[PDB]
Symmetry: D2
Subunit: 312 residues, 4 copies
């Protein structure tokens, strides 16, 4: 296409409006390079762990960005503090590559990231990453399925870019995404049926055997958080990974899995609650803490939230 709106033409053009320095653009342009390379690695990761190439790749692209200063990765015990020569104003938490076990079965997998601004004056530290999700300035994920997709939610909107492999560019395809109010799909690992709390297990029922002699909801669960969330965003519906007895605090880690999706979700007009509070309003105490997550089309998540304090 001639006037190809790249992700970069787009992030640089909205960045100009903050009367800024250019680091968001640098950040994202460098992140994009980790994403292409991981997409390429996964499109032939069967012709002859991966997590780590993907990981070392993302730290690398992001140090060199000259836009980072704290980096919180799924894979490292401690946060990574960017060397001074190369420090900048942003904080990025990220899961580099999600559902890596699911690549043997050819499950659509992805990289999820959340960017914060270091607002305080002292030496960069974990504390700076201990901000509530509400506070994020940018988030999204890159999906690796039939096509490689980058959904990017910033203050102005949630947008979708698809990588065009012919030119090695991410191109803008869906603009200012909004989720459907109510929709026909619930998504949850029904294998934990004996584990679930009553609120959920009533709701499941209400969708299979709908009291108003209606059409039941369909069941979906790819088992790769990014595929299910991206489905919930484009087609509407709900996704749940509620706490259960195998995992009372939730499974999906907060800083790099829940809070990005949550942000992307609310920015399109969905909700994401733990059933007891907004995901984005949680103040993290540990950079590796988990959360319950119910996200999706408002009326449904709501239908659930009422069932929560219809059972309170």
């Amino acid at each position: 296409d001639t006037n190809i709106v790249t992700l970069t033409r787009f992030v640089m053009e909205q960045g100009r409006k903050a009367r800024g320095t250019g680091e968001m653009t640098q950040l994202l342009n460098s992140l994009c390079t980790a994403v292409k390379a991981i997409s390429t690695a996964v499109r032939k990761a069967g012709i002859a762990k991966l997590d780590v190439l993907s990981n070392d790749l993302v730290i690398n692209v992001l140090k060199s960005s000259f836009a980072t200063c704290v980096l919180v990765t799924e894979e490292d015990k401690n946060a990574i503090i960017v060397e001074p020569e190369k420090r900048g104003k942003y904080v990025v938490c990220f899961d580099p590559l999600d559902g890596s076990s699911n690549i043997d079965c050819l499950v659509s997998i992805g990289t999820i990231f959340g960017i914060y601004r270091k607002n305080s004056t002292d030496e960069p530290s974990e504390k700076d990453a201990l901000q509530p999700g509400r506070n994020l300035v940018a988030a999204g994920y890159a999906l690796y399925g039939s096509a490689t997709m980058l959904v990017l939610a910033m203050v102005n909107g949630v947008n979708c870019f698809m990588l065009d492999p012919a030119i090695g560019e991410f191109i803008l395809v869906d603009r200012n995404v909004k989720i459907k109010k109510k929709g026909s799909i619930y998504s949850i690992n029904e294998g934990y049926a004996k584990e679930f709390d009553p609120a959920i297990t009533e709701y499941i029922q209400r969708k299979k055997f709908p009291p108003d002699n209606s059409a039941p909801y369909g069941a979906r669960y790819v088992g790769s958080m990014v595929a299910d969330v991206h489905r919930t965003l484009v087609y509407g519906g709900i996704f749940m990974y509620p706490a259960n007895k195998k995992s009372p605090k939730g499974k999906l880690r907060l800083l790099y899995e829940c809070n990005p999706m949550a942000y992307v979700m609310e920015k399109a007009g969905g909700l994401a609650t733990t059933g007891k509070e907004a995901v984005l309003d949680i103040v993290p105490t540990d950079i590796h803490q988990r959360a319950p997550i119910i996200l999706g089309s408002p009326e449904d998540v709501t239908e659930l939230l009422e069932i929560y304090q219809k059972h309170a």
Copy 2:
């Protein structure tokens, strides 16, 4: 890196269908399916930047004809099974669903091109009867999955071999020989939105997987909601996949001819059963090319743990 001895699926079917002296007709039919499968992957990868199943149907048909190895073709997307013109004829009957999941592209879920192949068992002029053979008479079946990679799985009489597209040289390269499914699994895949309409045999089974009586751990639910995807996760990780019938789709949803059957063949050559619930899917005599069938496939000790339950109900 850069490898002088690549196994393209052309070379590998040529070492099945040539030591067997069969003229390697098969090979040019399979080669041709690869050109089609490859173009559907490209188009899909750039999907959202450029119906797709009509055009993939037209594609598959055109390449198929030109293999000079077909006489009848059945599509999901076509009424009358296409009797190949004479000039280009050959002995095989190919059955196919060119773009399985056409809906699911929008949500970026893996989808695929399934295919079944027969050999015409008659001395005559082709007709869709030449196609109405059961699975036990399939010479080869397979499918190509458009996932985070484009993997072709091809099962002939020896067993199943996966092949994966190396997008750089554009050849399906061999990555797994003589595949055998896990014997028992830990995943049941089924659309529980239909909970209500399930026949009791199925329903007792879902509760036996969720709430094991013999105090093990509950099976993990999965369900991409794309047949290609759920079969393949079943083939490699084991697991049971069930699309039984309900009343809404009273004799099930999946067409026998080019869905339940090519899968069920791939399945059984890998040590996996495949049944309707009463009889095996590979022995039903097929009467309408678009005749539907229930199908339960996957690891033998689960298909069986469910057939007992089905037997225990009639």
Copy 3:
């Protein structure tokens, strides 16, 4: 865009070598040359980010063997013509230069894989004698060029067809049917560094192109210095390409077997002459697989404007 009726060279040679009833053996040999040609293009494109001709030699040989359509193979890079093992034999003799220009990669000049093919004309056990046939007995010759595109040119008995690699679906797609060279040209291509050692026939000709006596405009000099490149610019734009002999390379530089001959065949099927200077390159009886020959190819009215001059000197 996205086209349901693609002409892959597999489909096109199958409509030359099948209406002719010849078993389409040829086709699996050509198919196999495409896997090799494709991997050499990828490796070359990423060249400077990862000998290449040894590995392309090993590649071509391996794919070749596995077509089950060869019995003798000659390489530029090998001494003894490779007599294919029995299990995998077939009737063709293939002659090749797997990576012509191995030197020139460094300077990013287009280079290519040339090939000549024969049919074994004997009732025996293969030997490099089965290879020592002249060009008039070539069943098909071609070359693939690794340029700004990867174009395969294939000339069989009907004429020449160019094919170009569509890197997305990874298939050589047909782009020019039954090619015919320009009759007269305006380009002479030759390494004038060798000015001094040129035989007088050649020298009078270079002055006739630079300084036309019959007051036209001077021919444009060209010369990539890669045989594949200069032949192809000659094939399409016309022009005369000359690597005559000098004393330094006293019976010329280009090996007959798999350089002068496959080119000269491609050339003549496109209405272009090809000679050593005395005799046509396609009728020399080949005695050593590495036997060299001068070659002048290109548009007929120029080859001729030079053969007159050669005749006028002896």
Copy 4:
């Protein structure tokens, strides 16, 4: 590769040292996108003028860069003045796609560009592009052959990046390039033999029939200025497109063909003269004016330059 040095990681990292604004990086990152897309267009421009897609593409990427303000293209009668909303400090002259007729014969073709800094205070104008080549701050070319190559010469050096099609990134492969002093190749269209001036036609002789009973030079002429120049830079030698009677002012246009190559050449230690003066020292009077060009390994160009005033 994990720590993949992209062209952008490289231009941003040396740009930081000018204590700058970030426009060189923006400029080049946007130019790179026109180059990938033209490379892709040419690698299948036979499966079914081009100049113009290539052209409109480059203007577009470069307006949107927010780094341009005057653009001088081979293809436009007048310079292009970047709209204010989008103007920046740089001036780019470029031939978008060179030797377009040569794509039918599969000749290695390319895009050549030269970047200037607008130093004056008034409305951007042609005059700003009327600077001597000496003055350039950045130049190079992108080659489209077996591989797509981007040679980029800035104040610190001439460097070579090759596009890795697997990731859509230009990666750095040759560092701080230097040409060989003397070498074995002359390159010139010998078809103009009756046209050439004595200086040249003596030199040609001296190389074919070398007076010191030496090895003669080899002849090369791909007929696509970028392939011949890139050969002359990597392997050493000389390239000439001298003035002749069909073209007394030279053929190769100055602002966008001669002066970039010339700059790249001198930065690697070669020379480029018109036989009567340095190419880079010419002060252009018209943005479309041509030059004689002799560039290459010093001793040879010199051997020629002496023959020039051995004949003066």
